[PDB]
Amino acid sequence: GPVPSRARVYTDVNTHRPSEYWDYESHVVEWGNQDDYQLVRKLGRGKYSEVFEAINITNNEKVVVKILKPVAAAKIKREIKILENLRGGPNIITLADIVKDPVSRTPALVFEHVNNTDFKQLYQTLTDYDIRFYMYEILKALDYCHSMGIMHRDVKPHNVMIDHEHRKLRLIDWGLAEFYHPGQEYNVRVASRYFKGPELLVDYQMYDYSLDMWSLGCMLASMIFRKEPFFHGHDNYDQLVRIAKVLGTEDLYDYIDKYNIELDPRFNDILGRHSRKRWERFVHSENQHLVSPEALDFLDKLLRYDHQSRLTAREAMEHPYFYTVVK
Numbered sequence: 001g002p003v004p005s006r007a008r009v010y011t012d013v014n015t016h017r018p019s020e021y022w023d024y025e026s027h028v029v030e031w032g033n034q035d036d037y038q039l040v041r042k043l044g045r046g047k048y049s050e051v052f053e054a055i056n057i058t059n060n061e062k063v064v065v066k067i068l069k070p071v072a073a074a075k076i077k078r079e080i081k082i083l084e085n086l087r088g089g090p091n092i093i094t095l096a097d098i099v100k101d102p103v104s105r106t107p108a109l110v111f112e113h114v115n116n117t118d119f120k121q122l123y124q125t126l127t128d129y130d131i132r133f134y135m136y137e138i139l140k141a142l143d144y145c146h147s148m149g150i151m152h153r154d155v156k157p158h159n160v161m162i163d164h165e166h167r168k169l170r171l172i173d174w175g176l177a178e179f180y181h182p183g184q185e186y187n188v189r190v191a192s193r194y195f196k197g198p199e200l201l202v203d204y205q206m207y208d209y210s211l212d213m214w215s216l217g218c219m220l221a222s223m224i225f226r227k228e229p230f231f232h233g234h235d236n237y238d239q240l241v242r243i244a245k246v247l248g249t250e251d252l253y254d255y256i257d258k259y260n261i262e263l264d265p266r267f268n269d270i271l272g273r274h275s276r277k278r279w280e281r282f283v284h285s286e287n288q289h290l291v292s293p294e295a296l297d298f299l300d301k302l303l304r305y306d307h308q309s310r311l312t313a314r315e316a317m318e319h320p321y322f323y324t325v326v327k
């Protein structure tokens, strides 16, 4: 069987807290008035919710209303508890109200409004300074939630709202977020394909906060190399092959050896043999101004197969890559 693993930081934060903090099933929802909000336009639809721009007609303030689908309506108590526990934290989306949608009959979450710019238009238009500035802002949010015993589990560009005009950032969609308990085996069907950590791809269930740091590394590689996404898998199996063509197969085998994991035998006919690549192979005339020795050292310390060997969010904030950022 697989060898157990524990987070190297914030290991026992939930073991000391009173049951009320992490026992989300026991939480009682204080429902507000849905008629306080007037829906303006549909912003988007996912497999778990529909998002709307709305107006709070009492104070004329712009808000965002997230109406959960019945499939996600089952684990509403987890998302509500997490959002309340993290409320006021640096760069964390602020939950303003919870109401009962009259049409879906499911809960609807009301949030503060952020004037976001499409990442497919922004993230790939930033300067070297701005990439460093916004990465530091994301790290503030990740260290905060990890210090409060929570894993985000869906870090990706679409989950980071940025008001580039005001230089304001918010980490959103805490629908897949979970409380970290040492020794707990978790569902590997989390995060979006391109941002899934190797622990998920090899079906290793005893993962931790370090999963968010792999996802952050994928975001950084895409920004500094101008390649969207960086690891472009056709499916979950091809996703691991794309990673192995860059990081090499020897360190992958060492990883699975260390944790006594048995790879799905379907990998025997698709993985092949690959040496680790130097990051200069991805540098070209169009992205060279975004690349520095500090950016490459930082990336090297996030994109590691071994989840225990990755920089934590606090260690990442100490990195020379951020020395140029005004604090």
Ligand SMILES: O=C(O)c1ccc(Nc2nc(-c3ccccc3)cs2)cc1
Residues within 6 Å of the ligand: 043, 044, 045, 051, 064, 066, 093, 111, 114, 115, 116, 161, 172, 173, 174
């Ligand atoms: O916690 C959440 O899930 C959450 C919080 C705040 C959120 N704000 C906003 N979303 C959008 C949006 C959503 C989907 C497609 C296009 C635009 C614009 S401004 C969206 C979602």
